[PDB]
Amino acid sequence: APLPPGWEQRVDQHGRVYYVDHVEKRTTWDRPEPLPPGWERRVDNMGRIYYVDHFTRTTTWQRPTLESVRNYEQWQLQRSQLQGAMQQFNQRFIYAYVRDFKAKVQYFRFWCQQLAMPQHIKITVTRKTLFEDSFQQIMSFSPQDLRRRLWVIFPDYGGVAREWFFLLSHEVLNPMYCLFEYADNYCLQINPASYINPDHLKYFRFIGRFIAMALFHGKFIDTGFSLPFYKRILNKPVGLKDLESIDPEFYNSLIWVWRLSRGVEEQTQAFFEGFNEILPQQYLQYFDAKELEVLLCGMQEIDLNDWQRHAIYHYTRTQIMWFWQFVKEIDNEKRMRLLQFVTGTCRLPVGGFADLMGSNGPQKFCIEKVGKENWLPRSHTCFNRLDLPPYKSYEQLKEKLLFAIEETE
């Protein structure tokens, strides 16, 4: 198997084979893995080493391997699936029960309007190079300017901006940028190795701007951020329980008796510089993390028939009819809330409740009996599992469940 360009094979005075990298100026005993087809190592203007695929014309600072390429392709599939679900995306909507999301959203709309600057700015991007053009444009403008009316052009403004947010929110996860990773492909995280990208911080600032701009301009994105991510936006405690939402194996190990902030400090700081210069996170604090997710992602009608068709159970379809009564009685927003409580998110797979995914593969919606009646319902979102205590009255199950999903304590 031939050595990549720039490499040489030599033998030392002891007979041991070794390898010289004439480009990086390195020596090593370990034969470098060949690059995958279509990939070429290049040197930029400032002398930095990057890699280019001569079929996608993509580039990366991460030396492409079998794993990195596999991640990239998984992302290609993902991106295409979402993009293909665009029509459904454009149908997403926004606008004792002591939580009033509607009123919060109206207050927030008003707040944005009072900050909105007189029209407008032009953002010029192509579909083929959406990410890079967007980065150059968005970083070229002032925060003030980015609070003006957006005129996005691909060589009615609202639908093209809407589309722009859709598409970019997909592009942002492109593993080639080295910015994000998965804890599975279930839980999105900042990649601790983002450093291999010499410009990672500028890109996180760009993404911060991006997300804040979606919020400010009332546009949905189509990215599967974790609940702790939203919590972090709102300066809310990231506790042990959050670890179950992220890495259930790690949470199990811990539960045998701040690793979700350790590792990505710089990235998170850059992200918030970008975010907070557009829309300071502190003025988002009347929202809770689930509300914030709904605000960024949109609401959707849930198919109750699909939901019921694809649910599994120490109980059966014969106190569960109470649960489904509860689902049918509550409004769209509270169904979104219940969905968040159980699965961790208000976003549904394009295929539906059958295509539901968990922290170690597909895991269908699951309700199981556990606890006493004083017990609040519990959830294990990494397993889409609802811990439903044996309640004796429908009014009690509805009170308890409401109380649970509303997160009253």
Coordinates of all heavy atoms in Angstrom, one line a residue, residues 295-373, unseen atoms left out:
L295 N -39.1 27.4 20.6 CA -39.0 28.7 19.9 C -38.0 28.6 18.8 O -38.3 29.2 17.7 CB -38.5 29.7 21.0 CG -38.5 31.2 20.6 CD1 -39.8 31.6 19.9 CD2 -38.1 32.1 21.8
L296 N -37.0 27.8 18.9 CA -36.0 27.7 17.8 C -36.4 26.7 16.8 O -36.0 26.8 15.6 CB -34.6 27.3 18.4 CG -33.6 28.4 18.6 CD1 -32.3 27.7 19.1 CD2 -33.4 29.2 17.3
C297 N -37.2 25.7 17.1 CA -37.5 24.6 16.3 C -38.8 24.7 15.6 O -39.0 24.1 14.6 CB -37.2 23.3 17.0 SG -35.5 23.1 17.4
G298 N -39.8 25.3 16.3 CA -41.1 25.4 15.8 C -42.0 24.4 16.5 O -41.4 23.5 17.2
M299 N -43.3 24.5 16.4 CA -44.2 23.4 16.9 C -44.7 22.7 15.7 O -44.6 23.2 14.5 CB -45.3 24.0 17.7 CG -45.1 24.3 19.1 SD -46.5 25.0 20.0 CE -46.6 26.6 19.4
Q300 N -45.2 21.5 15.9 CA -45.9 20.8 14.8 C -47.0 20.0 15.4 O -47.0 19.6 16.6 CB -44.9 19.8 14.1 CG -44.5 18.6 15.0 CD -43.6 17.6 14.3 OE1 -42.4 17.5 14.6 NE2 -44.2 16.8 13.4
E301 N -48.1 19.7 14.6 CA -49.1 18.8 15.0 C -48.4 17.4 15.2 O -47.6 17.0 14.4 CB -50.2 18.7 14.0 CG -51.5 19.4 14.4 CD -51.6 20.8 14.1 OE1 -51.0 21.2 13.0 OE2 -52.3 21.6 14.8
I302 N -48.8 16.7 16.2 CA -48.4 15.3 16.4 C -49.5 14.4 15.9 O -50.7 14.7 16.1 CB -48.1 15.0 17.9 CG1 -47.0 16.0 18.4 CG2 -47.7 13.6 18.1 CD1 -46.5 15.5 19.7
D303 N -49.1 13.3 15.2 CA -50.1 12.3 14.8 C -50.3 11.4 16.0 O -49.4 10.7 16.4 CB -49.5 11.5 13.6 CG -50.6 10.6 13.0 OD1 -51.5 10.2 13.7 OD2 -50.5 10.3 11.8
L304 N -51.5 11.5 16.6 CA -51.8 10.7 17.7 C -52.0 9.2 17.4 O -51.7 8.3 18.2 CB -53.1 11.2 18.4
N305 N -52.4 8.9 16.1 CA -52.5 7.6 15.6 C -51.1 6.9 15.4 O -51.0 5.7 15.7 CB -53.3 7.5 14.3
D306 N -50.2 7.7 14.9 CA -48.8 7.2 14.7 C -48.2 6.9 16.1 O -47.6 5.9 16.4 CB -48.0 8.2 13.9 CG -46.5 7.8 13.7 OD1 -46.3 6.6 13.3 OD2 -45.6 8.6 14.0
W307 N -48.3 8.0 17.0 CA -47.8 7.9 18.3 C -48.3 6.6 19.0 O -47.5 5.8 19.6 CB -48.3 9.1 19.1 CG -47.5 9.4 20.3 CD1 -46.6 8.5 20.9 CD2 -47.4 10.6 21.1 NE1 -46.0 9.1 22.0 CE2 -46.5 10.4 22.2 CE3 -48.1 11.8 21.0 CZ2 -46.2 11.4 23.1 CZ3 -47.8 12.8 22.0 CH2 -46.9 12.5 23.0
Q308 N -49.7 6.4 19.0 CA -50.2 5.2 19.6 C -49.8 3.9 18.9 O -49.5 2.9 19.6 CB -51.8 5.3 19.7 CG -52.3 6.3 20.7 CD -53.7 5.8 21.2 NE2 -53.7 4.9 22.2
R309 N -49.8 3.9 17.6 CA -49.4 2.8 16.8 C -48.0 2.3 17.2 O -47.7 1.1 17.1 CB -49.5 3.0 15.3 CG -50.9 2.8 14.7 CD -50.9 3.2 13.2
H310 N -47.1 3.2 17.5 CA -45.7 2.9 17.8 C -45.2 3.1 19.3 O -44.1 3.5 19.5 CB -44.8 3.6 16.8 CG -45.1 3.3 15.4 ND1 -45.8 4.1 14.6 CD2 -44.8 2.2 14.6 CE1 -46.0 3.5 13.4 NE2 -45.3 2.4 13.4
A311 N -46.1 2.8 20.2 CA -45.7 2.8 21.6 C -45.6 1.4 22.3 O -46.4 0.5 21.9 CB -46.7 3.7 22.4
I312 N -44.7 1.2 23.2 CA -44.5 -0.1 23.8 C -44.6 -0.1 25.4 O -44.5 1.0 25.9 CB -43.2 -0.8 23.4 CG1 -42.0 -0.2 24.0 CG2 -43.1 -0.8 21.9
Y313 N -44.9 -1.2 26.0 CA -45.1 -1.2 27.5 C -44.3 -2.3 28.2 O -44.0 -2.2 29.3 CB -46.6 -1.2 27.8 CG -47.4 -0.3 27.0 CD1 -48.0 -0.7 25.8 CD2 -47.4 1.1 27.3 CE1 -48.8 0.3 25.1 CE2 -48.2 2.0 26.6 CZ -48.8 1.6 25.4 OH -49.5 2.5 24.7
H314 N -44.5 -3.0 32.0 CA -45.3 -3.9 32.9 C -46.7 -3.4 33.0 O -47.3 -3.2 34.0 CB -44.7 -3.8 34.4
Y315 N -47.3 -3.2 31.8 CA -48.7 -2.8 31.6 C -49.1 -3.0 30.1 O -48.3 -3.5 29.4 CB -48.9 -1.4 32.0
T316 N -50.3 -2.6 29.8 CA -50.7 -2.8 28.4 C -51.8 -1.8 28.0 O -52.2 -0.9 28.7 CB -51.3 -4.2 28.2
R317 N -52.3 -2.0 26.7 CA -53.3 -1.1 26.1 C -54.6 -1.0 27.0 O -55.4 -0.1 26.7 CB -53.6 -1.5 24.7 CG -54.2 -0.4 23.8
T318 N -54.7 -1.9 27.9 CA -55.9 -1.9 28.8 C -55.6 -1.1 30.1 O -54.6 -1.2 30.7 CB -56.3 -3.3 29.2
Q319 N -55.6 2.8 32.4 CA -54.6 3.5 33.1 C -53.5 3.9 32.2 O -52.6 4.6 32.5 CB -54.0 2.6 34.2 CG -53.2 3.3 35.3 CD -52.8 2.4 36.4 OE1 -52.6 1.2 36.2 NE2 -52.6 2.9 37.6
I320 N -53.6 3.4 30.9 CA -52.8 3.8 29.8 C -53.8 4.5 28.8 O -53.4 5.4 28.1 CB -52.1 2.7 29.1
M321 N -55.0 4.0 28.8 CA -56.1 4.7 28.1 C -56.4 6.0 28.7 O -56.9 6.9 28.1 CB -57.3 3.8 28.1 CG -57.4 2.8 29.3 SD -57.8 1.1 28.9
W322 N -56.0 6.1 30.0 CA -56.1 7.4 30.7 C -54.9 8.3 30.2 O -55.2 9.5 30.0 CB -55.9 7.2 32.2 CG -57.1 6.8 33.0 CD1 -58.4 6.8 32.5 CD2 -57.1 6.2 34.3 NE1 -59.2 6.3 33.5 CE2 -58.5 5.9 34.6 CE3 -56.2 5.9 35.3 CZ2 -58.9 5.4 35.8 CZ3 -56.6 5.4 36.5 CH2 -57.9 5.1 36.8
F323 N -53.8 7.7 30.0 CA -52.7 8.4 29.4 C -53.0 9.0 28.1 O -52.7 10.2 27.8 CB -51.4 7.6 29.4 CG -50.3 8.3 28.6 CD1 -49.4 9.2 29.2 CD2 -50.1 8.0 27.2 CE1 -48.4 9.8 28.5 CE2 -49.0 8.6 26.5 CZ -48.2 9.5 27.1
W324 N -53.6 8.2 27.2 CA -53.9 8.6 25.9 C -55.1 9.5 25.8 O -55.2 10.4 25.0 CB -54.1 7.4 25.0 CG -52.9 6.6 24.8 CD1 -52.6 5.3 25.2 CD2 -51.7 7.0 24.1 NE1 -51.3 5.0 24.9 CE2 -50.7 6.0 24.1 CE3 -51.4 8.2 23.4 CZ2 -49.5 6.1 23.6 CZ3 -50.1 8.3 22.8 CH2 -49.2 7.3 22.9
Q325 N -56.0 9.4 26.8 CA -57.0 10.4 27.1 C -56.4 11.7 27.3 O -56.7 12.8 26.8 CB -57.9 10.0 28.3
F326 N -55.3 11.7 28.2 CA -54.6 12.9 28.6 C -53.9 13.5 27.3 O -54.0 14.8 27.2 CB -53.5 12.6 29.6 CG -52.6 13.7 30.0 CD1 -53.0 14.6 31.0 CD2 -51.4 13.9 29.3 CE1 -52.1 15.7 31.3 CE2 -50.6 15.0 29.7 CZ -50.9 15.8 30.7
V327 N -53.3 12.7 26.5 CA -52.7 13.2 25.3 C -53.7 13.9 24.4 O -53.5 15.0 23.8 CB -52.0 12.1 24.5 CG1 -51.6 12.5 23.1 CG2 -50.8 11.5 25.3
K328 N -54.9 13.2 24.2 CA -55.9 13.7 23.3 C -56.6 15.0 23.9 O -57.2 15.8 23.1 CB -57.0 12.6 23.0
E329 N -56.6 15.2 25.2 CA -57.3 16.3 25.8 C -56.5 17.6 25.7 O -57.1 18.7 25.5 CB -57.7 16.0 27.2 CG -58.5 17.1 27.9 CD -58.7 16.8 29.4 OE1 -59.3 15.8 29.8 OE2 -58.2 17.7 30.2
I330 N -55.2 17.5 25.9 CA -54.3 18.6 25.9 C -54.1 19.2 24.5 O -54.3 18.5 23.5 CB -52.9 18.2 26.6 CG1 -52.3 17.1 25.8 CG2 -53.1 17.8 28.0 CD1 -50.9 16.8 26.3
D331 N -53.6 20.5 24.5 CA -53.4 21.1 23.2 C -52.1 20.8 22.5 O -51.3 20.0 23.1 CB -53.6 22.7 23.4 CG -52.5 23.2 24.4 OD1 -51.4 22.7 24.5 OD2 -52.8 24.3 25.0
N332 N -51.8 21.4 21.4 CA -50.6 21.1 20.6 C -49.4 21.4 21.4 O -48.4 20.6 21.4 CB -50.6 21.9 19.3 CG -50.9 21.1 18.1 OD1 -50.7 19.9 18.1 ND2 -51.5 21.7 17.1
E333 N -49.4 22.5 22.1 CA -48.2 23.0 22.9 C -47.9 22.0 24.0 O -46.8 21.6 24.3 CB -48.5 24.4 23.4 CG -47.3 25.0 24.1 CD -47.4 24.9 25.6 OE1 -48.5 24.7 26.2 OE2 -46.3 24.9 26.3
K334 N -49.0 21.5 24.7 CA -48.7 20.6 25.8 C -48.3 19.2 25.4 O -47.6 18.5 26.1 CB -49.9 20.6 26.8 CG -50.4 21.9 27.3 CD -49.5 22.6 28.4 CE -50.1 23.9 28.8 NZ -49.3 24.8 29.7
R335 N -48.7 18.9 24.1 CA -48.2 17.6 23.5 C -46.8 17.7 23.1 O -46.0 16.7 23.3 CB -49.1 17.3 22.3 CG -50.4 16.7 22.6 CD -51.3 16.8 21.4 NE -52.6 16.3 21.6 CZ -53.6 16.5 20.8 NH1 -53.5 17.3 19.7 NH2 -54.8 16.0 21.1
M336 N -46.4 18.9 22.6 CA -45.0 19.2 22.4 C -44.2 19.1 23.7 O -43.1 18.5 23.8 CB -44.8 20.6 21.8 CG -45.4 20.7 20.4 SD -44.2 20.6 19.0 CE -44.1 18.8 18.9
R337 N -44.8 19.6 24.8 CA -44.1 19.6 26.1 C -44.0 18.2 26.6 O -42.9 17.8 27.2 CB -45.0 20.4 27.1 CG -44.3 20.7 28.4 CD -43.2 21.8 28.3 NE -42.7 22.1 29.6 CZ -41.9 23.1 29.9 NH1 -41.5 23.9 29.0 NH2 -41.5 23.3 31.2
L338 N -45.0 17.4 26.4 CA -45.0 16.0 26.9 C -43.9 15.2 26.1 O -43.2 14.4 26.6 CB -46.4 15.4 26.7 CG -46.5 13.9 26.8 CD1 -46.1 13.3 28.1 CD2 -48.0 13.5 26.4
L339 N -43.9 15.4 24.8 CA -42.9 14.8 23.9 C -41.5 15.2 24.4 O -40.6 14.4 24.3 CB -43.2 15.3 22.5 CG -42.3 14.7 21.4 CD1 -42.4 13.2 21.5 CD2 -42.7 15.2 20.0
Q340 N -41.3 16.5 24.8 CA -40.0 16.9 25.3 C -39.7 16.1 26.6 O -38.6 15.6 26.8 CB -40.0 18.4 25.6 CG -39.9 19.2 24.3 CD -40.1 20.7 24.6 OE1 -41.0 21.1 25.4 NE2 -39.2 21.5 24.1
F341 N -40.6 16.1 27.5 CA -40.5 15.4 28.8 C -40.0 13.9 28.6 O -39.1 13.5 29.2 CB -41.8 15.4 29.5 CG -41.7 14.7 30.9 CD1 -40.9 15.2 31.9 CD2 -42.4 13.5 31.1 CE1 -40.8 14.6 33.1 CE2 -42.3 12.8 32.3 CZ -41.5 13.4 33.3
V342 N -40.7 13.2 27.6 CA -40.4 11.8 27.4 C -39.1 11.6 26.5 O -38.3 10.7 26.8 CB -41.6 11.1 26.8 CG1 -41.2 9.7 26.4 CG2 -42.7 11.1 27.7
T343 N -39.0 12.3 25.4 CA -37.9 12.0 24.4 C -36.7 13.0 24.6 O -35.7 12.7 24.0 CB -38.4 12.0 23.0 OG1 -38.8 13.4 22.6 CG2 -39.6 11.1 22.8
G344 N -36.9 14.1 25.3 CA -35.9 15.1 25.4 C -36.0 16.2 24.4 O -35.2 17.2 24.5
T345 N -36.9 16.1 23.4 CA -36.9 17.0 22.3 C -38.3 17.2 21.7 O -39.2 16.3 21.9 CB -35.9 16.6 21.2 OG1 -36.0 17.6 20.1 CG2 -36.2 15.2 20.7
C346 N -38.6 18.3 21.1 CA -39.9 18.6 20.4 C -39.8 18.2 18.9 O -40.7 18.5 18.2 CB -40.3 20.0 20.6 SG -39.2 21.2 19.7
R347 N -38.7 17.7 18.5 CA -38.5 17.4 17.1 C -38.8 15.9 16.9 O -38.4 15.0 17.6 CB -37.1 17.8 16.6 CG -36.8 19.2 16.6 CD -35.8 19.6 15.5 NE -34.8 18.6 15.4 CZ -34.3 18.2 14.2 NH1 -34.7 18.7 13.1 NH2 -33.4 17.3 14.1
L348 N -39.5 15.6 15.8 CA -39.9 14.3 15.4 C -39.1 13.8 14.2 O -39.0 14.6 13.2 CB -41.4 14.1 15.2 CG -42.2 13.8 16.5 CD1 -43.6 14.1 16.2 CD2 -42.0 12.3 16.8
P349 N -38.6 12.6 14.1 CA -38.1 12.0 12.9 C -39.1 12.2 11.8 O -40.3 12.0 12.0 CB -38.0 10.5 13.3 CG -37.8 10.5 14.8 CD -38.6 11.6 15.3
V350 N -38.6 12.5 10.6 CA -39.4 12.7 9.4 C -40.3 11.5 9.1 O -41.5 11.7 8.7 CB -38.5 13.0 8.1 CG1 -37.4 14.0 8.5 CG2 -37.9 11.7 7.6
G351 N -39.9 10.3 9.4 CA -40.7 9.1 9.3 C -41.8 9.0 10.3 O -42.9 8.4 9.9
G352 N -41.6 9.4 11.5 CA -42.6 9.4 12.5 C -42.2 8.6 13.8 O -41.1 8.2 13.9
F353 N -43.2 8.3 14.6 CA -42.9 7.6 15.9 C -42.3 6.2 15.8 O -41.8 5.7 16.8 CB -44.2 7.6 16.8 CG -44.3 8.8 17.6 CD1 -45.1 9.9 17.2 CD2 -43.7 8.9 18.9 CE1 -45.2 11.0 18.0 CE2 -43.8 10.0 19.7 CZ -44.6 11.1 19.2
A354 N -42.3 5.7 14.6 CA -41.7 4.4 14.4 C -40.2 4.5 14.3 O -39.4 3.7 14.7 CB -42.3 3.7 13.1
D355 N -39.8 5.6 13.7 CA -38.4 5.9 13.4 C -37.7 6.6 14.6 O -36.6 7.1 14.4 CB -38.3 6.8 12.1 CG -38.8 6.2 10.9 OD1 -39.7 5.3 11.0 OD2 -38.4 6.6 9.8
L356 N -38.3 6.4 15.8 CA -37.8 7.0 17.0 C -36.5 6.4 17.4 O -36.3 5.2 17.4 CB -38.8 6.9 18.1 CG -38.8 8.0 19.2 CD1 -39.2 9.4 18.6 CD2 -39.7 7.7 20.4
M357 N -35.6 7.3 17.9 CA -34.2 6.9 18.2 C -33.8 7.2 19.6 O -34.3 8.2 20.2 CB -33.2 7.7 17.2 CG -33.5 7.5 15.8 SD -33.5 5.8 15.2 CE -31.9 5.3 15.8
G358 N -32.9 6.4 20.1 CA -32.4 6.6 21.5 C -30.9 6.6 21.5 O -30.2 6.5 20.5
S359 N -30.3 6.6 22.7 CA -28.9 6.8 22.9 C -28.0 5.6 22.6 O -26.8 5.6 22.6 CB -28.6 7.2 24.4 OG -29.1 6.1 25.2
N360 N -28.7 4.5 22.2 CA -27.9 3.3 21.7 C -28.7 2.5 20.7 O -28.9 1.3 20.7 CB -27.4 2.4 22.8 CG -28.5 2.0 23.8 OD1 -28.4 2.4 25.0 ND2 -29.5 1.2 23.4
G361 N -29.3 3.3 19.7 CA -30.1 2.7 18.6 C -31.5 3.1 18.7 O -31.9 3.9 19.6
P362 N -32.4 2.6 17.8 CA -33.8 2.9 17.8 C -34.4 2.5 19.2 O -34.0 1.4 19.7 CB -34.4 2.0 16.7 CG -33.2 1.8 15.8 CD -32.0 1.8 16.6
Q363 N -35.3 3.3 19.7 CA -36.0 2.9 21.0 C -37.4 3.5 20.9 O -37.5 4.7 21.1 CB -35.2 3.3 22.2 CG -35.4 2.5 23.4
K364 N -38.4 2.7 20.8 CA -39.8 3.2 20.6 C -40.2 3.8 21.9 O -39.7 3.5 22.9 CB -40.7 2.0 20.2 CG -40.4 1.4 18.8
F365 N -41.3 4.6 21.8 CA -41.9 5.3 22.9 C -42.3 4.2 23.9 O -43.1 3.3 23.6 CB -43.2 6.0 22.5 CG -43.8 6.9 23.5 CD1 -43.4 8.2 23.6 CD2 -44.7 6.4 24.4 CE1 -44.0 9.0 24.6 CE2 -45.3 7.1 25.4 CZ -44.9 8.5 25.5
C366 N -41.9 4.3 25.2 CA -42.1 3.3 26.2 C -42.7 3.9 27.5 O -42.0 4.8 28.1 CB -40.9 2.5 26.5 SG -40.9 1.4 27.9
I367 N -43.8 3.3 28.0 CA -44.3 3.6 29.3 C -44.3 2.4 30.2 O -44.9 1.4 29.9 CB -45.8 4.2 29.2 CG1 -46.0 4.9 27.9 CG2 -46.1 5.1 30.4 CD1 -47.4 5.4 27.7
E368 N -43.8 2.5 31.4 CA -43.7 1.4 32.4 C -44.1 1.8 33.8 O -43.9 2.9 34.3 CB -42.4 0.7 32.4 CG -41.2 1.4 33.1 CD -40.2 0.4 33.7 OE1 -40.6 -0.8 33.9 OE2 -39.1 0.8 33.9
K369 N -44.8 0.9 34.5 CA -45.2 1.1 35.9 C -44.1 1.1 36.9 O -43.2 0.2 36.8 CB -46.3 0.1 36.3
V370 N -44.0 2.0 37.8 CA -43.0 2.2 38.8 C -43.3 3.3 39.8 O -43.8 4.3 39.5 CB -41.6 2.5 38.2 CG1 -41.8 3.5 37.1 CG2 -40.6 2.9 39.2
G371 N -43.1 3.0 41.1 CA -43.3 4.0 42.2 C -44.6 3.9 42.8 O -45.4 2.9 42.6
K372 N -44.9 4.8 43.7 CA -46.3 4.9 44.3 C -47.1 6.0 43.7 O -46.6 6.6 42.7 CB -46.1 5.0 45.8
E373 N -48.2 6.3 44.3 CA -49.1 7.4 43.7 C -48.6 8.8 44.1 O -48.9 9.7 43.4 CB -50.5 7.2 44.1 CG -50.8 7.4 45.6 CD -52.2 7.3 46.0 OE1 -52.7 6.1 46.1 OE2 -52.8 8.3 46.3

